[PDB]
Every structure is written in C-alpha cells, then in structure tokens.
Tab-separated table of C-alpha atoms in Angstrom:
chain	number	residue	atom	x	y	z
A	22	UNK	CA	-70.222	119.747	27.146
A	23	UNK	CA	-69.093	116.604	25.838
A	24	UNK	CA	-66.643	114.287	27.989
A	25	UNK	CA	-63.470	112.954	26.831
A	26	UNK	CA	-61.477	109.650	27.245
A	27	UNK	CA	-58.508	108.580	26.366
A	28	UNK	CA	-57.629	104.952	26.060
A	29	UNK	CA	-54.015	104.313	25.899
A	30	UNK	CA	-52.721	101.664	23.073
A	31	UNK	CA	-49.564	99.475	23.535
A	32	UNK	CA	-48.292	96.662	21.697
A	33	UNK	CA	-49.277	93.701	23.460
A	34	UNK	CA	-52.606	95.070	24.579
A	35	UNK	CA	-55.692	92.618	25.275
A	36	UNK	CA	-57.628	93.568	22.082
A	37	UNK	CA	-60.898	92.813	23.719
A	38	UNK	CA	-60.167	94.987	26.854
A	39	UNK	CA	-59.398	97.613	24.175
A	40	UNK	CA	-62.400	97.454	22.286
A	41	UNK	CA	-65.174	97.061	24.063
A	42	UNK	CA	-64.825	100.157	26.298
A	43	UNK	CA	-63.833	102.359	23.286
A	44	UNK	CA	-67.238	101.384	21.406
A	45	UNK	CA	-69.573	101.187	24.850
A	46	UNK	CA	-68.028	104.706	25.624
A	47	UNK	CA	-68.770	106.068	21.906
A	48	UNK	CA	-72.021	104.502	22.942
A	49	UNK	CA	-72.775	106.834	25.453
A	50	UNK	CA	-71.650	109.410	23.523
A	51	UNK	CA	-67.870	110.392	25.216
A	52	UNK	CA	-65.673	111.571	22.818
A	53	UNK	CA	-63.014	108.970	23.048
A	54	UNK	CA	-59.118	108.938	21.318
A	55	UNK	CA	-57.296	105.975	20.840
A	56	UNK	CA	-54.058	107.056	21.487
A	57	UNK	CA	-50.853	104.758	20.001
A	58	UNK	CA	-48.219	105.005	22.908
A	59	UNK	CA	-45.551	104.430	20.316
A	60	UNK	CA	-46.684	107.026	17.477
A	61	UNK	CA	-49.943	107.001	14.996
A	62	UNK	CA	-48.589	103.419	13.259
A	63	UNK	CA	-51.089	100.257	13.615
A	64	UNK	CA	-50.905	98.637	17.142
A	65	UNK	CA	-50.235	94.289	17.172
A	66	UNK	CA	-52.434	93.333	19.937
A	67	UNK	CA	-51.812	90.251	22.249
A	68	UNK	CA	-53.702	87.621	20.011
A	69	UNK	CA	-52.744	89.676	16.771
A	70	UNK	CA	-55.878	91.485	16.184
A	71	UNK	CA	-54.522	95.088	14.770
A	72	UNK	CA	-56.083	98.176	15.292
A	73	UNK	CA	-55.300	101.920	14.220
A	74	UNK	CA	-55.198	103.895	16.745
A	75	UNK	CA	-56.790	107.841	16.177
A	76	UNK	CA	-53.509	109.409	17.265
A	77	UNK	CA	-50.166	109.306	18.706
A	78	UNK	CA	-50.060	109.827	22.482
A	79	UNK	CA	-47.934	112.775	21.864
A	80	UNK	CA	-50.465	114.508	19.609
A	81	UNK	CA	-53.487	113.357	22.026
A	82	UNK	CA	-51.637	114.770	25.308
A	83	UNK	CA	-51.893	117.910	23.816
A	84	UNK	CA	-55.717	117.984	23.120
A	85	UNK	CA	-55.935	117.045	26.950
A	86	UNK	CA	-57.466	117.156	29.767
A	87	UNK	CA	-59.698	114.177	29.769
A	88	UNK	CA	-62.552	113.261	32.194
A	89	UNK	CA	-60.938	109.388	31.938
A	90	UNK	CA	-57.523	107.883	31.176
A	91	UNK	CA	-58.252	104.379	30.191
A	92	UNK	CA	-55.368	101.640	30.651
A	93	UNK	CA	-56.282	98.414	28.855
A	94	UNK	CA	-54.844	94.944	30.084
A	95	UNK	CA	-52.625	92.352	28.522
A	96	UNK	CA	-49.232	91.452	30.103
A	97	UNK	CA	-46.851	93.091	27.597
A	98	UNK	CA	-49.286	95.712	27.188
A	99	UNK	CA	-49.424	96.559	30.733
A	100	UNK	CA	-45.301	96.291	30.799
A	101	UNK	CA	-44.968	98.960	27.802
A	102	UNK	CA	-47.476	101.228	29.549
A	103	UNK	CA	-45.246	100.525	33.122
A	104	UNK	CA	-42.139	101.445	31.519
A	105	UNK	CA	-43.788	104.318	29.272
A	106	UNK	CA	-42.368	108.092	30.835
A	107	UNK	CA	-44.895	109.391	28.820
A	108	UNK	CA	-47.612	107.533	30.719
A	109	UNK	CA	-46.296	108.383	33.908
A	110	UNK	CA	-47.013	111.943	33.093
A	111	UNK	CA	-50.296	111.536	31.929
A	112	UNK	CA	-51.428	109.222	34.923
A	113	UNK	CA	-49.815	111.917	37.542
A	114	UNK	CA	-51.045	115.193	35.624
A	115	UNK	CA	-54.574	112.834	36.162
A	116	UNK	CA	-54.480	111.951	39.484
A	117	UNK	CA	-53.180	116.032	40.332
A	118	UNK	CA	-56.851	117.555	38.664
A	119	UNK	CA	-58.798	114.749	40.059
A	120	UNK	CA	-60.015	113.350	36.809
A	121	UNK	CA	-60.890	109.264	36.854
A	122	UNK	CA	-58.125	106.402	36.007
A	123	UNK	CA	-59.660	103.184	35.129
A	124	UNK	CA	-57.553	100.112	34.614
A	125	UNK	CA	-58.447	96.547	33.577
A	126	UNK	CA	-56.932	93.036	33.865
A	127	UNK	CA	-52.981	94.000	34.061
A	128	UNK	CA	-53.358	97.441	33.272
A	129	UNK	CA	-53.564	98.034	37.426
A	130	UNK	CA	-49.883	97.016	37.382
A	131	UNK	CA	-48.686	100.491	35.384
A	132	UNK	CA	-50.423	102.615	38.459
A	133	UNK	CA	-47.906	100.395	40.828
A	134	UNK	CA	-45.020	101.417	38.710
A	135	UNK	CA	-46.088	105.015	38.385
A	136	UNK	CA	-46.566	105.391	41.908
A	137	UNK	CA	-50.221	106.246	41.250
A	138	UNK	CA	-53.168	106.279	43.724
A	139	UNK	CA	-51.042	104.450	46.911
A	140	UNK	CA	-54.023	103.746	49.596
A	141	UNK	CA	-56.738	102.651	46.964
A	142	UNK	CA	-59.024	99.755	47.068
A	143	UNK	CA	-58.199	97.663	43.398
A	144	UNK	CA	-58.319	94.544	42.094
A	145	UNK	CA	-56.474	92.951	39.188
A	146	UNK	CA	-56.629	89.938	37.266
A	147	UNK	CA	-55.983	86.791	39.697
A	148	UNK	CA	-52.680	86.332	37.868
A	149	UNK	CA	-51.385	89.921	38.449
A	150	UNK	CA	-52.116	90.224	41.976
A	151	UNK	CA	-48.351	89.329	43.651
A	152	UNK	CA	-47.106	91.858	41.107
A	153	UNK	CA	-49.632	94.858	41.982
A	154	UNK	CA	-49.356	93.808	46.306
A	155	UNK	CA	-45.761	94.104	45.996
A	156	UNK	CA	-44.731	96.706	48.636
A	157	UNK	CA	-48.327	96.311	50.514
A	158	UNK	CA	-49.506	99.987	48.474
A	159	UNK	CA	-53.012	99.450	48.032
A	160	UNK	CA	-55.698	97.063	49.306
A	161	UNK	CA	-56.633	94.032	47.356
A	162	UNK	CA	-60.749	93.313	46.313
A	163	UNK	CA	-61.956	90.746	44.427
A	164	UNK	CA	-64.893	92.311	43.219
A	165	UNK	CA	-65.617	92.000	39.283
A	166	UNK	CA	-65.083	96.054	39.495
A	167	UNK	CA	-64.174	97.916	41.957
A	168	UNK	CA	-64.067	101.739	42.767
A	169	UNK	CA	-61.982	103.714	44.918
A	170	UNK	CA	-61.942	107.260	45.023
A	171	UNK	CA	-60.806	108.176	41.426
A	172	UNK	CA	-59.092	105.196	40.591
A	173	UNK	CA	-61.842	102.092	39.198
A	174	UNK	CA	-59.906	98.630	38.487
A	175	UNK	CA	-61.535	95.448	36.954
A	176	UNK	CA	-60.472	91.902	36.787
A	177	UNK	CA	-60.392	90.491	32.997
A	178	UNK	CA	-61.704	90.260	29.692
A	179	UNK	CA	-64.931	88.776	31.160
A	180	UNK	CA	-65.539	91.980	33.172
A	181	UNK	CA	-65.172	94.149	30.198
A	182	UNK	CA	-68.497	95.219	29.941
A	183	UNK	CA	-68.997	95.717	33.721
A	184	UNK	CA	-65.998	97.788	33.606
A	185	UNK	CA	-67.357	100.080	30.781
A	186	UNK	CA	-70.495	100.598	32.058
A	187	UNK	CA	-68.984	101.849	35.007
A	188	UNK	CA	-66.808	104.497	33.427
A	189	UNK	CA	-69.826	105.778	31.818
A	190	UNK	CA	-72.072	105.790	34.937
A	191	UNK	CA	-69.497	107.562	36.613
A	192	UNK	CA	-69.017	110.220	33.548
A	193	UNK	CA	-72.831	110.499	32.334
A	194	UNK	CA	-74.697	108.960	35.473
A	195	UNK	CA	-76.819	105.701	35.741
A	196	UNK	CA	-79.710	106.479	33.463
A	197	UNK	CA	-77.011	107.018	30.640
A	198	UNK	CA	-75.621	103.769	31.507
A	199	UNK	CA	-79.049	101.909	31.548
A	200	UNK	CA	-80.002	103.399	28.406
A	201	UNK	CA	-76.228	102.049	26.853
A	202	UNK	CA	-76.888	98.588	28.158
A	203	UNK	CA	-80.344	97.377	27.150
A	204	UNK	CA	-79.030	96.974	23.494
A	205	UNK	CA	-76.190	94.847	24.186
A	206	UNK	CA	-78.572	92.078	25.604
A	207	UNK	CA	-76.238	91.468	28.565
A	208	UNK	CA	-77.346	88.879	30.961
A	209	UNK	CA	-77.299	90.686	33.832
B	1	UNK	CA	-54.506	68.749	12.164
B	2	UNK	CA	-55.394	72.607	13.115
B	3	UNK	CA	-58.773	74.123	12.510
B	4	UNK	CA	-59.268	77.124	10.676
B	5	UNK	CA	-61.651	80.183	10.771
B	6	UNK	CA	-63.060	82.795	8.237
B	7	UNK	CA	-64.057	86.030	9.674
B	8	UNK	CA	-65.674	88.004	7.183
B	9	UNK	CA	-65.329	91.711	8.021
B	10	UNK	CA	-67.160	94.305	6.271
B	11	UNK	CA	-67.144	98.457	7.169
B	12	UNK	CA	-70.035	98.906	9.616
B	13	UNK	CA	-69.389	95.659	11.328
B	14	UNK	CA	-69.977	95.825	15.108
B	15	UNK	CA	-66.089	95.651	16.330
B	16	UNK	CA	-66.821	93.896	19.895
B	17	UNK	CA	-68.712	91.177	17.802
B	18	UNK	CA	-65.840	90.697	15.525
B	19	UNK	CA	-62.518	91.179	18.245
B	20	UNK	CA	-64.026	89.173	20.824
B	21	UNK	CA	-64.757	85.592	18.603
B	22	UNK	CA	-61.170	86.202	17.058
B	23	UNK	CA	-59.405	86.420	20.651
B	24	UNK	CA	-61.072	83.873	21.712
B	25	UNK	CA	-60.844	81.298	18.809
B	26	UNK	CA	-57.252	82.286	18.726
B	27	UNK	CA	-56.818	81.199	22.475
B	28	UNK	CA	-58.421	78.186	21.812
B	29	UNK	CA	-55.527	77.509	19.266
B	30	UNK	CA	-57.576	77.798	16.244
B	31	UNK	CA	-56.196	79.183	12.866
B	32	UNK	CA	-58.032	82.425	12.311
B	33	UNK	CA	-57.714	84.515	9.091
B	34	UNK	CA	-59.898	88.431	9.038
B	35	UNK	CA	-60.610	88.869	5.973
B	36	UNK	CA	-61.550	91.748	4.246
B	37	UNK	CA	-65.036	92.272	2.152
B	38	UNK	CA	-63.323	95.075	-0.086
B	39	UNK	CA	-59.605	94.147	0.204
B	40	UNK	CA	-56.818	94.430	2.599
B	41	UNK	CA	-57.326	97.923	3.272
B	42	UNK	CA	-58.235	98.917	7.017
B	43	UNK	CA	-61.845	98.591	8.132
B	44	UNK	CA	-63.636	101.537	9.784
B	45	UNK	CA	-66.297	99.585	12.387
B	46	UNK	CA	-69.304	100.714	13.342
B	47	UNK	CA	-68.158	102.479	16.571
B	48	UNK	CA	-64.847	104.071	14.160
B	49	UNK	CA	-62.633	101.320	15.452
B	50	UNK	CA	-60.613	100.777	12.806
B	51	UNK	CA	-58.996	96.949	12.229
B	52	UNK	CA	-56.597	95.823	9.856
B	53	UNK	CA	-57.654	92.382	8.274
B	54	UNK	CA	-54.995	89.438	8.183
B	55	UNK	CA	-56.323	89.145	4.018
B	56	UNK	CA	-58.899	90.508	1.824
B	57	UNK	CA	-61.677	87.941	0.753
B	58	UNK	CA	-60.397	87.229	-2.211
B	59	UNK	CA	-57.218	85.879	-1.099
B	60	UNK	CA	-58.516	84.045	1.789
B	61	UNK	CA	-60.720	82.306	0.006
B	62	UNK	CA	-57.884	80.590	-2.429
B	63	UNK	CA	-56.984	78.909	1.292
B	64	UNK	CA	-60.081	77.318	2.168
B	65	UNK	CA	-62.036	75.205	3.342
B	66	UNK	CA	-62.617	76.556	6.679
B	67	UNK	CA	-63.921	74.585	9.283
B	68	UNK	CA	-66.472	77.626	10.624
B	69	UNK	CA	-67.092	80.849	8.505
B	70	UNK	CA	-67.918	83.680	10.983
B	71	UNK	CA	-70.236	86.636	10.237
B	72	UNK	CA	-70.198	89.280	12.408
B	73	UNK	CA	-73.059	91.729	13.239
B	74	UNK	CA	-73.463	95.665	13.037
B	75	UNK	CA	-76.475	96.781	10.953
B	76	UNK	CA	-74.341	98.239	8.041
B	77	UNK	CA	-71.875	95.551	8.139
B	78	UNK	CA	-74.569	92.690	7.671
B	79	UNK	CA	-76.103	94.884	4.857
B	80	UNK	CA	-72.574	94.883	3.452
B	81	UNK	CA	-72.452	91.076	3.561
B	82	UNK	CA	-76.011	90.413	2.596
B	83	UNK	CA	-75.270	92.156	-0.496
B	84	UNK	CA	-71.622	90.819	-1.414
B	85	UNK	CA	-72.085	87.910	-3.953
B	86	UNK	CA	-68.520	86.715	-2.820
B	87	UNK	CA	-70.365	85.866	0.493
B	88	UNK	CA	-72.977	83.885	-1.057
B	89	UNK	CA	-70.573	81.791	-2.492
B	90	UNK	CA	-68.596	81.428	0.647
B	91	UNK	CA	-71.644	80.305	2.238
B	92	UNK	CA	-73.242	78.060	0.012
B	93	UNK	CA	-70.088	76.703	-0.545
B	94	UNK	CA	-69.689	75.818	3.337
B	95	UNK	CA	-72.799	74.674	4.049
B	96	UNK	CA	-72.561	72.154	0.637
B	97	UNK	CA	-69.417	70.269	2.762
B	98	UNK	CA	-71.473	70.549	6.015
B	99	UNK	CA	-68.958	73.127	7.997
B	100	UNK	CA	-69.754	75.284	10.134
B	101	UNK	CA	-71.558	78.925	9.748
B	102	UNK	CA	-71.682	81.142	12.835
B	103	UNK	CA	-73.371	84.129	12.888
B	104	UNK	CA	-74.111	87.222	15.536
B	105	UNK	CA	-76.771	89.616	15.982
B	106	UNK	CA	-77.399	91.274	13.029
B	107	UNK	CA	-75.043	89.018	10.896
B	108	UNK	CA	-77.893	86.120	10.724
B	109	UNK	CA	-79.789	88.283	8.238
B	110	UNK	CA	-77.149	87.382	5.734
B	111	UNK	CA	-78.116	84.013	5.623
B	112	UNK	CA	-81.555	84.845	4.730
B	113	UNK	CA	-80.148	87.205	1.948
B	114	UNK	CA	-78.272	84.583	0.609
B	115	UNK	CA	-80.705	81.204	0.871
B	116	UNK	CA	-78.698	79.612	3.360
B	117	UNK	CA	-80.015	77.343	6.118
B	118	UNK	CA	-83.663	77.348	5.780
B	119	UNK	CA	-86.148	75.828	8.355
B	120	UNK	CA	-83.178	76.062	10.874
B	121	UNK	CA	-83.820	77.650	14.563
B	122	UNK	CA	-81.979	80.533	14.601
B	123	UNK	CA	-81.602	83.734	16.762
B	124	UNK	CA	-80.902	87.458	16.063
B	125	UNK	CA	-80.400	90.250	18.089
B	126	UNK	CA	-84.505	91.224	18.907
B	127	UNK	CA	-84.413	95.073	16.615
B	128	UNK	CA	-83.344	92.326	13.692
B	129	UNK	CA	-85.993	89.829	14.467
B	130	UNK	CA	-88.590	90.789	11.556
B	131	UNK	CA	-85.921	91.121	8.968
B	132	UNK	CA	-85.051	87.471	9.308
B	133	UNK	CA	-88.231	86.094	9.657
B	134	UNK	CA	-89.750	87.530	6.163
B	135	UNK	CA	-91.080	84.789	4.583
B	136	UNK	CA	-91.264	82.448	7.768
B	137	UNK	CA	-88.284	80.349	5.997
B	138	UNK	CA	-86.705	80.190	9.614
B	139	UNK	CA	-87.958	79.483	13.483
B	140	UNK	CA	-86.680	82.114	15.849
B	141	UNK	CA	-85.560	81.370	19.428
B	142	UNK	CA	-84.947	83.523	21.881
B	143	UNK	CA	-81.976	81.669	23.608
B	144	UNK	CA	-78.875	83.617	23.318
B	145	UNK	CA	-76.591	81.223	21.373
B	146	UNK	CA	-78.776	78.756	19.045
B	147	UNK	CA	-76.974	76.116	17.351
B	148	UNK	CA	-79.455	74.147	14.907
B	149	UNK	CA	-77.518	71.377	12.915
B	150	UNK	CA	-74.935	73.150	11.038
B	151	UNK	CA	-76.428	76.924	11.654
B	152	UNK	CA	-74.913	78.945	15.230
B	153	UNK	CA	-76.673	82.468	15.581
B	154	UNK	CA	-76.509	84.700	18.415
B	155	UNK	CA	-78.244	87.896	19.806
B	156	UNK	CA	-75.811	90.629	20.156
B	157	UNK	CA	-72.792	92.415	21.879
B	158	UNK	CA	-73.401	91.028	25.274
B	159	UNK	CA	-73.682	87.061	24.278
B	160	UNK	CA	-70.293	87.585	22.101
B	161	UNK	CA	-68.354	85.357	24.780
B	162	UNK	CA	-71.086	82.532	24.782
B	163	UNK	CA	-71.002	82.705	21.227
B	164	UNK	CA	-67.408	82.379	20.685
B	165	UNK	CA	-67.191	79.865	23.453
B	166	UNK	CA	-69.622	77.975	21.256
B	167	UNK	CA	-67.437	77.841	18.447
B	168	UNK	CA	-64.408	76.701	20.169
B	169	UNK	CA	-66.701	73.226	21.923
B	170	UNK	CA	-68.101	72.732	18.440
B	171	UNK	CA	-64.608	72.659	16.739
B	172	UNK	CA	-62.434	71.385	20.120
B	173	UNK	CA	-64.780	70.329	22.295
B	174	UNK	CA	-66.059	70.878	25.274
B	175	UNK	CA	-62.523	70.816	27.643
B	176	UNK	CA	-60.829	73.184	25.600
B	177	UNK	CA	-63.397	75.515	25.738
B	178	UNK	CA	-63.708	75.396	29.436
B	179	UNK	CA	-59.919	75.811	29.524
B	180	UNK	CA	-60.038	78.515	27.734
B	181	UNK	CA	-62.666	80.416	29.533
B	182	UNK	CA	-61.671	80.019	33.006
B	183	UNK	CA	-58.631	82.986	32.522
B	184	UNK	CA	-61.082	85.298	31.269
B	185	UNK	CA	-63.060	85.846	34.176
B	186	UNK	CA	-66.716	85.792	33.029
B	187	UNK	CA	-69.713	85.514	35.723
B	188	UNK	CA	-71.129	82.386	34.457
C-alpha cells in the first residue's frame, strides 16, 4: 500500500532540487529510489556535491511502476536527461499509464525533448522559458508550482519545498502534506 | 582572497541542511570543504541520502583556518557532533580567532555540549529548545535566523536558504548575497 517515487539523477543535476524532494517524500512515507542515469556510481552534481544513488536506472526500471517520476533541474543535468533514450522510455510509459511526472527548474525541458505532455500548462526557471517554448507545444505559466493533468512543474531551487509538498499532496493527500510540512519551519 | 567554509558532516545529519548551504555558498564563490566526521567514507544522512565528503575532518583540520564553520542539524547528526572531541577543538579554536560559527536546527546543541558562545542569543528548532537551554547559558530567540556576535543560528530545514544567505552576507557582503539570491526564485 506504499506509494513509490523514482528520482532520476544525472551528472550536473541541481543537488538542492534532488535532495529536497527526496527528503520530503521520504518524510511522507513514500518509497523513493534515487536512480543514477549512468549506473550505480557516485554522481557529481552541479555545485560539486557528490551523491550516491540507490540503484542504477537500468535496475530501477525493472522494479516499476512508480506513482511519480521526478526530474530535477540543473542545466547540464536536464541536458543529460533530454538526451537519454532510457528516460524517453520511462517517461512515455509513465504518461501511458497516467502516472504523475514532476520536473523542476530546467528539468521540464526534458519533457519537450521526449515529446511528453504536449498541450499542458507548465512552468520552468525563467532562464529556461525560451527553450521549453520552442514550437509553442505548451502553455507557459509563471506560477511557482503548476499542475496540469498529470504534469507537475516548478521553477527553481527556491521553489523546491513547494514542489515536493505538491508531490506529497498528489500522492498521499492534503493532510499528510500538512503533517509533513509543520516540522520543517517553512514561512508560508 | 577567497573565503573558506568548513561543513562538518556526520551520520544522521539532515541532508537538506547540509546541501543547501554548501550549494549556496559555492554559488557565492566561497571555497567549501564538506568534511566527514568519521573519515573520507560516504555518509548516510537522516533521510538516507548518501553524500561523499570532500575530505576527512582530520585532513580538513590541517588546511585551516576557515572563515565559517558550519554545523548542520538532524538529531543524530548533532549528537555525533556534540560527542566528538575533534569538533570541540575546532569550535574552540574558531571561537578564539573570532571566526564565524553557524549552526542550524538541532546543530546549535553541539555548541552547548562544547561550551561554545555562552551568553549569546541563539535559536534552534522548537523541538530542540529545552536541550539548548539546560542551564540558562544562552538567551533564546524565535527569529528564523539569529546572529549574535560571531554565533549565527537558525531553526529548521525550511530556514536553510535564509541561513545560507546570512552566511554569504556575513562573509562576502549584502550585494553578493542579493546577486546569488535572485536566480534561486525564493519568495521573499
């Protein structure tokens, strides 16, 4: 009866945007797998924080399905996500079974690369707007967190807590999100 | 001419409170060393995020002095900090040369354990208040970030960004802090 989350971790990912959702989702009782795009080996994030993934994406792919697939940002991280055929397959499968897809900052640009969720309202980091909108395939929002259908997007490292709590609220409900939020000492 | 920061990383540390200051301080151009209390080996944080430190605390101690020593929280992490003789020595030396000491959430309780900064105004996580105040050696504040003399404290994972930016402002000044803050997409 446990919800499951896949977090895809590539070289150059924004480490804050990786750790905050993982930590919060685990506080909410979600089983999170931090899966390394390139293997089980340690991943050097954008600000040189080095994180050990729980599994390779190859192995984590076989233990599906997940209730949410999480794509962190960081410019080089999103580019590695956008170029990976394994991500495309995971995302396409998740879209077909109507599971949640969550991406933050530059992460939403992987969606465009993989032709995921066309027609949806999305937000990105402001500096990633032009890239996300090449072709007019999405409608842009400046909300800090945006949720359209099964696509949940958010804007930057500073929105990471709100992004993560929105994932909790979607998987586990508003009361669990409120319960996990209180000990964090957020402002609003 | 580069400012230097030491972040002391122990088993059971709050990984969000570790990664957010490291990342922000590095955005501000500070040279940060993430030093593992027990050695160079990977550290399992409170929510099972596993981080590789840059160096052992033993080696990092020899490359001093630092303009700021940073103590993350997490209950078991702070307890490991409070029990470590190496931390006591580092903190006592930092206090003597009038360098900044920064601690968040449960982290300030290591200060009490090590008889650091008595008489100062401090804040902690609400759940750590009773422990910090055993003996009446500090004055308690409920400000989200509190700075009294060379002691900078903060309350919880949700105050991590404000804590980190306060470190930046103290080391590098208000304009650098404002410059690093803008791309993060913080609310206030």
